[PDB]
Amino acid sequence: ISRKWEKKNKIVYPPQLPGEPRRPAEIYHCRRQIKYSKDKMWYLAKLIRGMSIDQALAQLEFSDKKGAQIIKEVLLEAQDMAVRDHNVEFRSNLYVAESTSGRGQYLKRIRYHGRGRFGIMEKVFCHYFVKLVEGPPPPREAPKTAVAHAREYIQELRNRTITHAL
Amino acid sequence: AAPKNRRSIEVNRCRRRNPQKLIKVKNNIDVCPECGHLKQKHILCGYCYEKVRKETAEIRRQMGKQEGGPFRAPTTETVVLYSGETPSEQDQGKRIIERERKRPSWFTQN
Amino acid sequence: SEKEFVEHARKAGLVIPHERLERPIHLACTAGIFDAYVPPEGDARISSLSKEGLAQRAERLKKNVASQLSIRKIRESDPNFKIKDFPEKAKDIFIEAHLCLNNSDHDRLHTLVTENCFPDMVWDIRYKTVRWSFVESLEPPQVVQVRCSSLMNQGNIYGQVTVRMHTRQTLAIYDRFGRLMYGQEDVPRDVLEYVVFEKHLVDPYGSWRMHGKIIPPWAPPKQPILKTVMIPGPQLKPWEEFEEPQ
Amino acid sequence: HGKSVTWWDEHLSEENVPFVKQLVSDENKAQLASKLCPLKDEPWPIHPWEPGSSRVGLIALKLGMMPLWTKDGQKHVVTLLQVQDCHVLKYTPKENHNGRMAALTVGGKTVSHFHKSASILEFYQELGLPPKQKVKIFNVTENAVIKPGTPLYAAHFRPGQYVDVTAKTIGKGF
Amino acid sequence: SQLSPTELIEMQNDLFNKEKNRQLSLTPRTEKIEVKHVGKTDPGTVFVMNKNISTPYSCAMHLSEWYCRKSILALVDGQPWDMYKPLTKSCEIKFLTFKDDDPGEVNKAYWRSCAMMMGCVIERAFKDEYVVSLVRAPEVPVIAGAFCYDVVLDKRLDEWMPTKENLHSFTKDARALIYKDLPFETLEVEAKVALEIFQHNKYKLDFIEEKASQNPERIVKLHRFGDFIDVSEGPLIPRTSICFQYEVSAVHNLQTQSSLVRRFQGLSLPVHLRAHFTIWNKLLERSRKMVTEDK
Amino acid sequence: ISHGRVFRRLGLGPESRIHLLQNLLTGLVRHERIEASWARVDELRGYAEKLIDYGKLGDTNERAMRMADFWLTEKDLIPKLFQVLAPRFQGQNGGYTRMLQIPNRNEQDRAKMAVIEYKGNCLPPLPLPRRDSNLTLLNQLLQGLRQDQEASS
Ligand SMILES: [Mg+2]
Ligand SMILES: [Mg+2]
Ligand SMILES: [Mg+2]
Ligand SMILES: [Mg+2]
Ligand SMILES: [Mg+2]
Ligand SMILES: [Mg+2]
Ligand SMILES: [Mg+2]
Ligand SMILES: [Zn+2]
């Protein structure tokens, strides 16, 4: 087994000199050995990437997946750590910077078919990782406009040089 | 039939992350004016309805003790009265249900 | 197929195992404070008077019967003990103990502070960064009272000395991310404390160790914190209604 | 900005929902009745019939079927097609649609404003007509052009003529 | 005086910021004030805010993002309060939204704020060869057709009614102002300092003196967003981006024996209460009609 | 091809469909407010509307008694229908019951729930969706149109 996500909260940074930009808070939290599957849990994690904590909880409130309740508990307990263990005011000023799902330890069983045959059954366990960063959520990138494509294409035609020139 | 070759992870990632198979966001989430919790526009509030259901169970539990038999039902209308209240003239001729707790704010007397 | 999971951690305690210890636990210092000194409410203004403050404190030492008996008990248990030289030793221990927290050196702190004092000054600042300094001492320290207790179970005698020190300090606590949290750096705030020390007399070594820190009830409130906090409201179950106390 | 979805009835109070329905309903009758003078509102010039000319069709609603008998005793089945609201919407020049024949646009029956797109509602506002359900394109020669907004009636077809019918058939699924 | 339009705006911003720094310097130490939440949704919540630097918007951020977006006007005790004006003393707070059964206070604030946006667009639309003098923003109830703003134009611009394209040009500029997110800043400024801000505008000086007469302390309220400073009565909405539908309806002429005032009327609706296209056009036509309500 | 079919396939067949609605209807009459699956509640609404119509016919009509005999599987509810429910509903013609969508059941199946009840029941009211008050900004603007329209017309 490997446990490095838990140890990321023990990092102590040197004090900042006056005049430097304020360092946004970073909170690392995770839950181990969740009965939910790895692939099914991934879709929930992909849903809440880049959204603020309040709207992330709203989306997971009404989701019918069994893991929606599991993730909502993780976010709620991570928010309490941010406001108490860390000096993060404005408990609504957090956004989910990164969320992902890993695989845990599986239990192997025997699944019967018939004719004396069998198949190996894998009990599935998964982990959930979430990182919360203080501040408003970043703005999502818009698709490239018509001018953007034209500018790149003209630039590309201007970079051309005589191949095998001299 | 059986597969001919193992699917590469590049092909699997395209299929497993297609926009159709992703979870769609919900844009009809609103805050309940009375209790401040979350609910959908076309759905009753979960917290407010649970508040009513708990009270309704208590009222029905009181009625069961007022009719011991399993096939005993009133032939008249029913009125629920809380502590500190007395039946009105229009409420006479009906069975009376007594509750010790104070009349809740959401419940309205007529 | 018959494989299962192991390593479920739980903490269970019973009376029987605690009573079956072959070697009883040895305590270096007592847990609580035998008696809390009650300073008069006028110490905030007497501290500005030199002759009145020193003379009044001197009389309290020479007039208390219980305190003088405790002083003689220390002398009988261990000679070459002087009340006059104690505050200078107590003042240096106070400065050294806090400078250990600045450098986060726990090995030296164990010798300076006692077992009952170590968790209080370490637990909260474990992952934080503090910078404490000493600038001036407006009023020299004075010995308030001395008490002793005789535990006939083992004959252990502990000598508690209460010292009142008027100290000028510069406290600044930094967040683990490097941002300022509690106080500035260049402000020499004036603070008054009633530090209680403790020494084990039966122990041939018997280092003088700081035991506790007593704050007067009428002490001015501490400087406000920079971070804004919110007190959460009473969590309400659906079948319970809110009531407003007046 | 994750703006929430909304509909026309979301923010309307109980004392104004009947008022809004009355407001839109009165506008439809005023607009429809103001188009009942095609020859009194400066129509386009009318040309005499010429060989090879094509006329303008209609958009009708299929009611049902009735039996019909002829003078020779034979039995025929007829389908009742009703024209509810038919108005020419827009005219396309000959060289901008096909290059051989002009195109005349005809709308369907009246529908509610509250369930149409912004562009569709804006287009009808300029003309001054209530929104239509279905819109079809008719190929019409230049000598049979009709000014947009001119109403059309079932009298456009005289008995004894042969006509075509184009519509989506009954969908039976997979 | 010889002041270009860029310089006079810069002078006012410098004066406003200088006054803002003076107010901040009046509080040397951060003082803790206990604010009790008396709202219906979350009773019993107690906030511990800083004096003169903590705004009720920052108070709402402790609860959830829903209070940050839904709330428009905060109710300090029994007095309406902006969501960007810092608190002063320990009190009780309540948040008012459009959905509440009595949005009359919020409706008045929204109507005032939309009038201020029109004044900024009108002032910075005419060429520098013409003089534009903003008079005031008359208080008209929301039950009327639309909000109106009074503007005095040049003497040589007397016989000029804006065309349909010109009226639509103001709307496009207003929407551009809506596109950028500009918060509203509320500051209490002494009457004589306010006269310095509006030295060029004769009518504004008269308006300041009239408002200063109603208060014994000779104190007036100034509101600034972006680079525009104007005097208005009552609170304002916290954010510019609250407005979604904005349109300048038409203009009207009110001739007085001393001067001529142009009445610019326009209708707007917020993001929360946006209406259908069919309903919007019906309301827009009523906004064309003259609005006459001053006292 | 299910064109024109207004009924739904429930239970083990057409006979089990009636019995499932027979038990739900019996529970609705006795308790006046029950919750079940949204699809099953929608079907139950049609029968509850017409059952009151049979109640209005009277206690003496033979067809009404036979019709109420089959649907009211508990025999102590027939007097209730003809003496409580029927006398209460005399004014309205079709507004007998309300249907609202309860949030999904907190179980594995995550079914779509609904609540069905009779008018004027002796129970605490459901949190009905209340419309915006007339004092709202949008409503005030529209009320200006009505006052001006009524002033001239
Ligand atoms: Mg076998
Ligand atoms: Mg295998
Ligand atoms: Mg496998
Ligand atoms: Mg079909
Ligand atoms: Mg069907
Ligand atoms: Mg089935
Ligand atoms: Mg149905
Ligand atoms: Zn609710």
TrEMBL record, chain B:
Belongs to the bacterial ribosomal protein bL32 family. The keyword Zinc applies. GO terms for cellular component: mitochondrial large ribosomal subunit. Component of the mitochondrial large ribosomal subunit (mt-LSU). The mitochondrial ribosome (mitoribosome) is a large ribonucleoprotein complex responsible for the synthesis of proteins inside mitochondria. Keywords: Metal-binding, Mitochondrion, Ribonucleoprotein, Ribosomal protein, Transit peptide, Zinc. It is found in: Mitochondrion. GO terms for molecular function: structural constituent of ribosome. GO terms for biological process: translation. Residues 83-110 are annotated as: Disordered. This is Large ribosomal subunit protein bL32m. Zn(2+) binds at C32, C35, C45, C48. Its main location: mitochondrion. Residues 91-103 have a biased composition (Basic and acidic residues). It comes from Sus scrofa. The gene is MRPL32.
Automatic annotation (TrEMBL), chain C:
The keyword Acyltransferase does not apply. It is found in: Mitochondrion. Keywords: Mitochondrion, Ribonucleoprotein, Ribosomal protein, Transit peptide. Its main location: mitochondrion. Residues 67-215 form the Tim44-like domain. GO terms for cellular component: mitochondrion; ribonucleoprotein complex; ribosome. Component of the mitochondrial large ribosomal subunit (mt-LSU). Within the mitochondrial ribosomes, required to direct the nascent polypeptide toward the tunnel exit and position the exit at a distance from the membrane surface. Belongs to the mitochondrion-specific ribosomal protein mL45 family. This is Large ribosomal subunit protein mL45. It comes from Sus scrofa (Pig). The chain holds residues 52 to 297 of 306 of the full protein.
TrEMBL record, chain E:
This is Large ribosomal subunit protein mL39. It comes from Sus scrofa. Its main location: mitochondrion. InterPro entries: Beta-grasp_dom_sf, Pro-tRNA_synthetase, TGS, TGS-like, Thr/Ala-tRNA-synth_IIc_edit. Residues 31-97 form the TGS domain. GO terms for molecular function: nucleotide binding. It is found in: Mitochondrion. It comes from the Eukaryota. Belongs to the mitochondrion-specific ribosomal protein mL39 family. Keywords: Acetylation, Mitochondrion, Ribonucleoprotein, Ribosomal protein. GO terms for cellular component: mitochondrion; ribonucleoprotein complex; ribosome. Gene3D superfamilies: 3.10.20.30, Threonyl-trna Synthetase, Chain A, domain 2.
UniProtKB/TrEMBL annotation, chain F:
Mg(2+) 1 binds at H3. Mg(2+) 2 binds at D42. Pfam families: Ribosomal_L17 (PF01196). It comes from the Eukaryota. Transmembrane segments: none annotated. One of its GO terms (biological process) is translation. Gene3D superfamilies: Ribosomal protein L17. GO terms for cellular component: mitochondrial large ribosomal subunit. Keywords: Metal-binding, Mitochondrion, Ribonucleoprotein, Ribosomal protein, Transit peptide. One of its GO terms (molecular function) is structural constituent of ribosome. It is found in: Mitochondrion. Belongs to the bacterial ribosomal protein bL17 family. This is Large ribosomal subunit protein bL17m.
